[PDB]
Amino acid sequence: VIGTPWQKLDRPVSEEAIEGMDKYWRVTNYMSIGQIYLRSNPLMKEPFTRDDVKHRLVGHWGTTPGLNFLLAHINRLIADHQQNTVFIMGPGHGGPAGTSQSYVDGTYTEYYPNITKDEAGLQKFFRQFSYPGGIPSAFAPETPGSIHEGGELGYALSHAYGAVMNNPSLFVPCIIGDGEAETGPLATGWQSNKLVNPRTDGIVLPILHLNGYKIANPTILARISDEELHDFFRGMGYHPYEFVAGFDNEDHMSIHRRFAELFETIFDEICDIKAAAQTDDMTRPFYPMLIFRTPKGWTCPKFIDGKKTEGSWRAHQVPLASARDTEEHFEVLKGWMESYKPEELFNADGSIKDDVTAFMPKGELRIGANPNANGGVIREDLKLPELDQYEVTGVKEYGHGWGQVEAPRALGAYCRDIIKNNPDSFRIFGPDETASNRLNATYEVTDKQWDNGYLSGLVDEHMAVTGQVTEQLSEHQCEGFLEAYLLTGRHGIWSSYESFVHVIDSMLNQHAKWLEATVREIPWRKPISSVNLLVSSHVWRQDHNGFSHQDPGVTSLLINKTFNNDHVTNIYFATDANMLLAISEKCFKSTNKINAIFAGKQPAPTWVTLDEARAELEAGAAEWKWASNAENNDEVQVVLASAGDVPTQELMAASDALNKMGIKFKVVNVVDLLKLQSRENNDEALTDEEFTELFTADKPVLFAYHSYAQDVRGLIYDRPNHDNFHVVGYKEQGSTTTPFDMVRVNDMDRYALQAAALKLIDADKYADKIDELNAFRKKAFQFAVDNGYDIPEFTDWVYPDV
Template structure:
């Protein structure tokens, strides 16, 4: 495949003049060819070029797909091909109406790309038959613009994200045009309505250009669309209010001349691209003083354009009836079979394809060449363009730890200092995304080296706003997610930091991206891209002032539902483990990495060397925290995952050491949550032998978990010791209260964990009855203190891991700075 990346002509201007007749004919022929192939995919099993009269056995038994939006997508594709070839303009085509899948497949086939990546789908009659047969057919391809479609980064099955993906692709791609088609049904979604404001975050100098094309065909599945039914001047003012210069094209309705609408589209495209070129030239010359009014196009055409106008006496074109399959009985009734054959013949396939089934040379000449073809652009296969990040050594940012909890640090603030160095070392392919929370999430150190991108009005009192910042903040989780996805899918790196409770807003967007990654693993020509990395903070246990509405750790449960080869969940317990974890996830490919970490001051338990070893294993015994001796089996295992649960487990272990020194306690901390799962279920999973070695097969396990406790049961249900597992976590109890009162509300506190040990260790109940009562009293005392003083009781608030001498443990007890390597886990399991 010829590469033109190094010699594209960027943002050239051309005279705006009517197309000559030959060019109009060529554009129209391409459009007809794409329409013919699209109809063929929906309906045809055989007889692809109508070499014989159409028979019912030539038609698929199950007619699936969407026709209504497809002819408009094909029309735009044909016209974009003309300007791309003339201007050598690198272009990515994003189709918000992703159910127009047959059109994008058809155009990739016409350009030759489809046959290059699927060599059995050749550009001849037999290849066309395979192209038709595979569409929405068992063992074939989906009906949407899926990962299998060359040139696509946007599935479009769930509407609303076309523009956010488009802008994500344009950031840091100064020579890229992203033609983003927005369906008028999609335009009614909240995320799409918000994403019009993405133009306030574009730097005309260093970013590419998104050309939004609002395709008004009037109808959704069963209803008219809002934007198609408001007055034209109101629609134009809406687009101007969003900061665009709208250009209008309308045609294809009864009585309209097809040649006229081709001329309209051609002239508007040239005007819009000339407008863009002027903005780009002014930016490069330094004469652009105001935010540009970027062009956008409104294309008004009838829904189902070019299909039979009336079927069974009912209007189909320019009606909701053309949305999916207009001829639902083409196989079952002679009348519909005849209509289908007439429909296919209306495109005059004999003029478009030669006797072998190949596209005739004159029509094929409309397409650009090499990677200028929209179906072949490397920007739609981002792994081809991906460069490794230059990552500074995270060890240089470590928190010094003389002994466990001897140093207090804000974990995400420490991470922010490292991320600042990452931003500085990668000035054109790494960005931080977040909904107005970068500083709130303690990542503010990045503002020492960059600003927040902002192309709207700037005032003297604004802080950290600039045209070319590396941080993108908008108070819309949808936009942050969409921007990042577009950025990653086109070959760059980034992270999304968010309050834990509100990451749920993008649950379905995460679903789509995870599904995309899962499918691309099975497509050899799709190259790996950088992982989608979340940093979830301001988490459930430390929402001291926001309260119950901000307390929800359930995103982890949602993520774990996806394929094991895609998802990873990390719960680093302190600043040093967070640094090690994030260095790892930024190096990874083709995963969704969820990292949950606190932003409040908290103890640092592990020095950096121990933190690295612990993270590489994913979990391990903290010998310094337990009271078992090597070679002995513990009486009880205290497990923990998450920073606050770890703190409470260590405090419980300290209480047990003081009050039940004869009890052999093992403490196991989990960083990589998927290590708990069976190795047959997840690539990171432990073998049964290693799980039993760490947690035992027959001793009580008291497990303190960051999120909803049933997830731990779900991950471990096949383990030998599952019946001995007792999990504490968030159980939907919360309010605006102190940190320790919050854990007490959910029975995750140290006192309750000690009670659990007493209740679950055989024979301990009666012997430790007095201690159990003391723990109950301690909970009451702590609760009353918060109600009286408005803060946590000092013995909890000021607790740190004690020196060995303070615990009453004899000399020769556990050391503090060593992490056990009990399980044979084979490194980081990537």
């Protein structure tokens, strides 16, 4: 247990704490401006000159003094209440406030010993911000206290709420930009309070950083009427409080006293909600939220060159862009830095006075030190049930290609038992698709958590105020909840219809970049569990839906995060259920990855045994010797290669026809896609020798690919024999139609695959056979048209074991 959670003070904030908060605010304002502007001479010792100003002024002042003010008060809160606390910096461009925070709390020097607590350290701290060889401009993963960089805006609230799931002692003040609140993902994020439980989860306090402006515009929320702003948050299930400061001549000490008192009313109400939830955990309370209305750029010069700067979008980035070049700008910078009176805040040796920091929390309650903000220090391996019990044994008993299993059901049974073994640290998310993607065996041990109205057991099933499944019709919520759940040291998986995974492409990009920075250069940030995404209800079998639901292209996005041997991205094609089991165990053990696990949920053949799946997964690609009919590679007329459940089904049927014609070939299945890349691009891929052994040195390869053929072409560009690969993939063809038609129109059906194989072998010789196969596809199509279902010869085919 960290600290003493949800305790009220029952006394006013002390005058000593108010004095320390104003010193904090002034010192973090001063150091934030030093980080942006100063290359040397951080204490402005004589001579202080333009030569001390950075040649390239980059970074953001506007948001920053409001964040420094809240951080003073959140620090004071944490210390007085001993409250386990992670904050979210929605306006992540306020990096300097987050680095100042860590430098003041002592974690910066603890994690970065060269950046010491004295004039030499402070000089280096100022120079390195946004600087070549230095540190980023945003609240990056290399800052102690960050679980959310906030570079791409919109995910502040999904992260805040994912962090408090199953974390009942944790408090998350979530600082949201008022421009950020104009984004889609943030706008839906407010509604998460219908999906957390006040007894079993922790508490988010949204703080709207209503500074009136985004980069070059006012914001929507700051200019609507007060009555609309309050109704809006009340209608989203919050009790709105609002604080207004900085627009008149009110002295800063009164501002701190008024804010501390308000913040204590807010926290008392959170503590009442937490206490009440021990007895009534079914009534959804109105959680407080805070509207925090202060001037953008607060405490910078009111006007610069005749233009209003404090209280304006002009304060957004870097005021005084000529601070190095003019002297008029230099004098303004100088008076601005002086207004904080650093001579009272730093000792002669350049260490921050004890005065400034006596009110601060200590030890693991410090914002930089809390292990929830470095959740790998708390993560434990999952207690995984043995895989063998889930195996589809029909392939051992009856043969390769047996049955009509719905593959994700085996993963559901496995997830069920994971939740049973790990009842408060493994969650499932879905955007209203958990049952649709067949992971509903999980409901045998838990419910979808829903903290909003109930009506009737005739309609409410597998749903309760507490539980380990979470659904909301929003891929942004599912992805963002899961990310923070992982970043705070827990585990889980989510599932999405494949085409809609694209809604969150850009979130995958940011989490991949968080991982990249981390595996490269932040070894104190310990490994977290991986994002595990079941990509299902795929392009080939969207039976109730049509062309809008046919887009397997997240493969292609993921290919753009496969650099430098970071190894933070995996693309797996689950050939069948036993392959799915083997991939999933590996993903549930992995850390520091995004794993995209492709599987069909339609009834489908099971191809491999579990033991086979386990060996084939590890190689990445394997020959299926029981399916090949060639003696060796020299006798092979074509390589039949497949990635995905449906391409594999269609290639298998093609191999069966090709065998019966006396064509000699081998069958290669591809599971771990990126292991096709060269060793030069991927030090864990198949070696050239292993690749040649699979795909031959010079025979034609027919490659039937689940997604866009572009992917495979670009990946094998420098591989031996790559010029002989013919890649067939999805090509933007299809609609609401039968299963054969959907493969037919992309040349993916078995008849077209057989034809393509014949054509690669000898186009002249098999010209008639090819015609005949093409004519057969037409006839099968007409049959579907005339009759309403696919030709029995297509649907009834099973691979020659039985």
